[PDB]
Structure 1
Amino acid sequence: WGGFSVSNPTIQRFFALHYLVPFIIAAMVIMHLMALHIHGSSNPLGITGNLDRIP
């Protein structure tokens, strides 16, 4: 809280954090895409897709 209840210290620090977390999200999306690029995506048939691929 920064005090005894929800007050001026709380609102001012919540805006500083609302600015920061989106840039952390952008960093975890890259880690998300890096782990996908290992084996590639899946398909609705649930079987291997190595026999037919398109760019």
Structure 2
Amino acid sequence: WGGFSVSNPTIQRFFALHYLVPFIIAAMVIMHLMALHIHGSSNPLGITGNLDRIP
């Protein structure tokens, strides 16, 4: 918390980290899409979907 008080460094670092964390969001979402593309998608029927597919 940048000491017992609040000054410029505290709010500045808070704004910087709110700016930065969504970049980690983007990277981990890239990982999420990679895993999705590797493993495919499920179906509402809860059954195998390899029988038919469309682009």
TM-score (norm 1): 0.86
Alignment gaps of 5+ in structure 1: none
In structure 2, C-alpha distance between the alignment counterparts of 1:53 and 1:22, rounded to whole Å: 34
Contact 1:43 1:49 in 2 (8 A): yes
Alignment gaps of 5+ in structure 2: none
* Runs of 4+ residues over 2 Å off in structure 1: 5-9
Contact 1:3 1:9 in 2 (8 A): no
**Residue 2 of structure 1: CA displacement?**
0.7
The alignment covers a number of residue pairs equal to 55
Matches within 5 A, 1:1-55: 1-55=1-55
**Residue 10 of structure 1: CA displacement?**
1.7
TM-score (norm 2): 0.86
Q: Higher helix fraction: Structure 1 or Structure 2?
A: 2
> Among the aligned pairs, what percent are the same residue?
100
